[PDB]
Amino acid sequence: PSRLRKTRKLRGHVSHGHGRIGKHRKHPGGRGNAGGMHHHRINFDKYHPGYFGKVGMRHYHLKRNQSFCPTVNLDKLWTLVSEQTRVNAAKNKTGAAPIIDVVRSGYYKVLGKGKLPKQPVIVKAKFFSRRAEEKIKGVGGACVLVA
Amino acid sequence: SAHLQWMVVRNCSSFLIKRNKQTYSTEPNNLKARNSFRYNGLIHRKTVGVEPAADGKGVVVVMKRRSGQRKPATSYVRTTINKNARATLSSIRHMIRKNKYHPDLRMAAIRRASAILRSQKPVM
Amino acid sequence: DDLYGTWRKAASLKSNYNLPMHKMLNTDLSRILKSPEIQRALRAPRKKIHRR
Amino acid sequence: KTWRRWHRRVNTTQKRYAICSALAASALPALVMSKGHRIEEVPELPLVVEDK
Amino acid sequence: GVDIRHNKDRKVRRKEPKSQDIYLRLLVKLYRFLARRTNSTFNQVVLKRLFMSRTNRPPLSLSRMIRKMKLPGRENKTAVVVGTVTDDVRVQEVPKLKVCALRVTSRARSRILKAGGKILTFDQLALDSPKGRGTVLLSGPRKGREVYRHFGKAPGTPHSHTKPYVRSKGRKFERARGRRASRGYKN
RNA sequence: AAAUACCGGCACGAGACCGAUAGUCAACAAGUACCGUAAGGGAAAGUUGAAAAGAACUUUGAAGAGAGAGUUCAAGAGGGCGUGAAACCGUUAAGAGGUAAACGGGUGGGGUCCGCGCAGUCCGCCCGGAGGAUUCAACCCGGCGGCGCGGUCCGGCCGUGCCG
RNA sequence: CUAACACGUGCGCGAGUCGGGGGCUACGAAAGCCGCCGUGGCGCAAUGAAGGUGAAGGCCGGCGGCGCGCCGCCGGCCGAGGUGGGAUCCCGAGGCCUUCCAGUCCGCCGAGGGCGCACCACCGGCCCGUCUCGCCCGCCGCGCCGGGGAGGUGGAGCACGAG
RNA sequence: GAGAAAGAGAGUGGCGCGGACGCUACGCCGCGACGAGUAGGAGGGCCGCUGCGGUGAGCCUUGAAGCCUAGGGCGCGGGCCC
RNA sequence: UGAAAGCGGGGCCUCACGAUCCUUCUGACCUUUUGGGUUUUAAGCAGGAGGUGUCAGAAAAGUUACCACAGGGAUAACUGGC
Ligand SMILES: [Mg+2]
Ligand SMILES: [Mg+2]
Ligand SMILES: [Mg+2]
Ligand SMILES: [Mg+2]
Ligand SMILES: [Mg+2]
Ligand SMILES: [Mg+2]
Ligand SMILES: [Mg+2]
Ligand SMILES: [Mg+2]
Ligand SMILES: [Mg+2]
Ligand SMILES: [Mg+2]
Ligand SMILES: [Mg+2]
Ligand SMILES: [Mg+2]
Ligand SMILES: [Mg+2]
Ligand SMILES: [Mg+2]
Ligand SMILES: [Mg+2]
Ligand SMILES: [Mg+2]
Ligand SMILES: [Mg+2]
Ligand SMILES: [Mg+2]
Ligand SMILES: [Mg+2]
Ligand SMILES: [Mg+2]
Ligand SMILES: [Mg+2]
Ligand SMILES: [Mg+2]
Ligand SMILES: [Mg+2]
Ligand SMILES: [Mg+2]
Ligand SMILES: [Mg+2]
Ligand SMILES: [Mg+2]
Ligand SMILES: [Mg+2]
Ligand SMILES: [Mg+2]
Ligand SMILES: [Mg+2]
């Protein structure tokens, strides 16, 4: 809506909000990101450090599908499987641990962040953190690998 | 309820007219005919309206009942008062006061009935 | 109610929809302000105009 | 130009909120007369007619 | 002539919400009355938090709800946010709670009413406790938004751990001269 | 082959577009008139009225052009003619005039129109004087409506309430 | 005017969110609908050049290991920081008179004392890189193998979402 | 409206049928102090133009848009109504 | 080094010096070299150096009286001013 915009208030004002001394000229500092190391070096080093230079190994034909390994945390591990399984696991006197296939939900790797509630599991994953598998051992439960 | 539909009607109603720095409202059951919350007649459960009769003389008084709120045909009851100016006003005063029927409009209806009857008695 | 659900039955003819809950339920503000639950817990209404 | 952004896309849930509000306000008598429909002789305005 | 400056002569607060919905303004019409005709300073805080923005009413989640209720002393106490009681999925147990909020997420409503608590809203809070007697007022994390990581002392500057605005995070995107002792200088 | 692209062509439809200095250069005898040796450059220009009923006839002048008459609702629509503004100009009326004119504040004088001014407001209650009514209060019958809530009447329906 | 970005605001939903591409059924080239059309985008995890790794712990019992009174491994228990300031609230020594005394209930005020939101400051803690010190553990392959701790230090991190 | 933290608090024992205005709560009212301004920033416009969805049982050949005016006027003003 | 307390990570103190990209050297039984492995090679990571004296760091000769453009009274060639 131009009815709400600034130019409706700037009619009659002879400089249109850009000044009389410094007129609204076309490109006073160069076009685009110009003058990185010359006259805007103060801006590109007070606000974008690291912008100039090369670092690291060039990897030519990179494929983002080879390195697909999404993660899940243990405090949202039980959010993969419906509530009835963990309720029946809390009610079961046998010790039958529920089986949770994280790959079926769509996470290849299990990392261990949160507190995991004290009832057993069979967590099968494609990878494991060190702390995640020992939290699963500390609640008492198995870490099954799958390819 | 009432306070939500007032905040809908208050600026968006077809009965509202706004010109010459004055705001009005032309719903049929409005006393003092002005856009406010007390006087708007479409909203409330209980509502007094004063209209001139279908005949040239007489004042009809409109009372909104409590039961058919969503039923517009059986909501408003009419009563026609073709009497002298004193007893017309005492009738409207007794209907609003002693029935406990929306007592803030008790004087505005008497003002309106007094303005209708002055127009119905003949021109000078 | 089949299309747009109910407040406890969901939308049967949509996939996953339910009516949006209110932000206040008892809307009739006159009965809330004229209520003995509130009218007790108020200070005295000072309404004497004190002109200059 | 022709490639002015002519169209607007609205979220589905508030598209549904809008028609729920329209339907729910089409049941109140004050909100229909203030819209302008002369209605005062209707039997009941959430008005259901025979399926015939 | 008077020797005073007028720079801060206009105080800058809100006195009505910038929203235009009618239910929030009916809540405002209620708490204007309950804030000037009670001596409770709870009603002034509720009135002031009804004015605020979406970013000044951040959502308080359920696992912080229950955590700030598990403190001693505040048992069988109702508890009030002005924003949104969202669900938190990384919590299994949920005690019974007496929550009072503007809008609760449907999954959090199911979670609380399954545990057997009850969900008031503010027009019910006014009838239940007009002076706010026996409430616990809470608020979400106001610095929880990610835009408070771009703020403060600028990057490219010693002892300033500020996330810079980078169009795509990688090894090529602002790693090179300001960020390393090898190439240029480190900060 | 298909899904794909289409400011050219044939035939269509539509528009939160422009409305004759806008929208194509072009609403019209427009890539026309015109300019340039040439390649090429390239405009301006819509509207009488419902219907021509487009002013018969008389009279001055050689004629353009008038004065009458007539058409029309209207010539205050008369063949580039709807509306007909501004700058500028003619004439009439009023007023003024030696520091160019013009301007701000303050009044004064003269105009021009308006107040439909030009014996000046009404409105309640009380008192008195003359009147005229099919006249009030209380009762009876019928209809309609509202609610110390019938402490607790009978019957329904609903719960974004619970249980069996 | 189109596109990208940043912040502030209003709206819907909310650890999710969004059909924008496709499809199904005059105004309407609209509108509705999909959900085994969430492919996908952004977000929920960071760090490292990279191989990669990838976000609390504490207590008890047994077994100069002895000249880990400090645990290698198991059984049980508590369990997800602290300090200061902190809007709100919670408790209540006493008291708010009608003729005076005893004397209950409701409301209110208040000395003093708490549980402390958000946020700020500080101290801790955890993840990734790096450096130093040092001892212990694992087995299908006892190896130029793998895991671990303590102390600094580099990070756009975590520390009960906020998109 | 009253110089003094708090109840015009409940309980137990010795005729005449009457009472102005109000409150578009985005409304109305009450006090106090203040008002300069270029470059610039912001707010409010019941200032104005053109078109679109609603609406005014709007206006209009018993004369709309436009144009003129020594007429009556309103608003600080943009402008507007006769 | 001094017996030791201690002193010393250049010059008694105030100056004596240089980013990105690129090259060269040094370092670790280091990482990658792309389907697996071995070996060269290259790419990396960390630390010096090769230098930008216009010293926060373009790679750079003149002439125009045949001259052109955008500007400047921010600025000379006249008067006038102090
Ligand atoms: Mg200005
Ligand atoms: Mg500007
Ligand atoms: Mg200028
Ligand atoms: Mg400038
Ligand atoms: Mg300058
Ligand atoms: Mg510019
Ligand atoms: Mg330079
Ligand atoms: Mg002054
Ligand atoms: Mg000033
Ligand atoms: Mg200021
Ligand atoms: Mg069409
Ligand atoms: Mg033209
Ligand atoms: Mg024209
Ligand atoms: Mg043209
Ligand atoms: Mg023309
Ligand atoms: Mg013309
Ligand atoms: Mg005419
Ligand atoms: Mg004409
Ligand atoms: Mg003409
Ligand atoms: Mg003269
Ligand atoms: Mg910016
Ligand atoms: Mg924002
Ligand atoms: Mg992306
Ligand atoms: Mg000023
Ligand atoms: Mg040393
Ligand atoms: Mg090979
Ligand atoms: Mg020469
Ligand atoms: Mg020149
Ligand atoms: Mg000189």
Side-chain angles (χ1 to χ4, degrees), chain D residues 22-39:
Chain D
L23 291 174
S26 65
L28 277 72
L31 300 182
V32 183
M33 295 182 71
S34 295
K35 182 69 170 64
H37 304 284
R38 182 165 287 174
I39 206 173

Side-chain angles (χ1 to χ4, degrees), chain E residues 15-164:
Chain E
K15 72 274 193 186
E16 63 177 359
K18 290 286 289 295
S19 181
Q20 289 294 112
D21 53 350
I22 61 169
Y23 291 101
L24 186 66
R25 286 184 182 269
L26 288 172
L27 290 177
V28 171
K29 286 184 179 181
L30 184 143
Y31 281 103
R32 289 277 174 81
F33 185 76
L34 290 184
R36 79 173 187 270
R37 284 187 64 184
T38 62
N39 56 3
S40 68
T41 53
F42 176 75
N43 288 135
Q44 291 178 355
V45 182
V46 175
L47 180 61
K48 180 170 68 177
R49 286 185 176 180
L50 284 172
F51 301 134
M52 291 178 187
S53 69
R54 174 68 62 85
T55 64
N56 291 319
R57 289 178 286 109
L60 185 140
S61 63
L62 194 145
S63 71
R64 192 167 189 168
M65 187 71 194
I66 64 170
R67 178 181 174 183
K68 296 291 186 291
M69 290 300 107
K70 282 175 68 67
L71 274 69
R74 51 188 67 186
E75 296 296 325
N76 67 18
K77 196 83 66 64
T78 183
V80 176
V81 311
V82 190
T84 298
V85 181
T86 65
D87 189 9
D88 187 76
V89 294
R90 60 183 193 274
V91 61
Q92 297 88 17
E93 191 271 331
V94 47
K96 65 182 290 183
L97 295 171
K98 194 172 183 181
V99 190
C100 194
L102 261 64
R103 183 184 64 85
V104 183
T105 302
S106 67
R107 180 166 286 179
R109 290 178 66 91
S110 177
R111 185 74 65 87
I112 293 172
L113 297 179
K114 185 178 179 180
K118 65 183 291 185
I119 297 170
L120 282 75
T121 173
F122 278 4
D123 55 351
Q124 293 179 356
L125 181 61
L127 290 174
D128 197 358
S129 69
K131 291 179 183 291
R133 186 170 294 275
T135 62
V136 174
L137 190 60
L138 294 176
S139 67
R142 289 173 66 94
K143 295 294 183 70
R145 302 191 296 120
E146 69 177 357
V147 304
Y148 291 104
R149 292 173 179 174
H150 300 280
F151 291 172
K153 193 168 179 63
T157 290
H159 301 88
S160 69
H161 307 285
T162 305
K163 182 191 283 289

Side-chain angles (χ1 to χ4, degrees), chain B:
Chain B
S1 69
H3 282 276
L4 71 84
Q5 58 182 356
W6 163 248
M7 294 191 72
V8 181
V9 163
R10 63 176 290 274
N11 211 353
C12 190
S13 65
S14 71
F15 296 109
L16 174 143
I17 57 174
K18 291 199 286 181
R19 67 178 66 91
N20 291 112
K21 276 77 178 172
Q22 297 172 356
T23 302
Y24 290 114
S25 187
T26 64
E27 65 266 9
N29 300 118
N30 195 354
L31 305 183
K32 293 185 179 292
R34 66 168 178 263
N35 191 12
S36 179
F37 177 69
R38 293 188 179 275
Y39 287 143
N40 196 351
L42 301 175
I43 297 171
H44 301 88
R45 297 182 62 83
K46 51 178 65 66
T47 295
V48 182
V50 171
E51 296 176 354
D55 197 359
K57 80 282 293 179
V59 170
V60 295
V61 176
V62 180
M63 299 281 286
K64 189 172 182 180
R65 68 177 68 188
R66 79 176 302 170
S67 64
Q69 289 295 293
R70 69 187 186 275
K71 294 180 182 179
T74 65
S75 180
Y76 294 106
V77 295
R78 305 294 182 89
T79 175
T80 306
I81 304 167
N82 193 359
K83 294 193 290 187
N84 46 356
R86 195 186 303 272
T88 300
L89 269 61
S90 72
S91 299
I92 294 169
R93 181 182 293 112
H94 285 84
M95 285 189 287
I96 299 171
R97 180 184 300 276
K98 298 184 74 66
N99 293 320
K100 294 285 188 179
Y101 191 86
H102 205 246
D104 49 355
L105 271 58
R106 190 258 304 160
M107 197 63 203
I110 292 174
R111 298 285 176 87
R112 188 163 178 84
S114 178
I116 295 297
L117 292 175
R118 199 266 182 198
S119 67
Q120 289 182 357
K121 70 178 182 179
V123 66
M124 185 63 73

Side-chain angles (χ1 to χ4, degrees), chain C residues 1-20:
Chain C
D1 54 357
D2 292 332
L3 285 170
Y4 296 137
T6 321
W7 294 106
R8 57 182 177 180
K9 180 174 74 174
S12 68
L13 296 172
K14 277 92 173 67
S15 69
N16 45 2
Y17 183 67
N18 212 346
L19 289 172

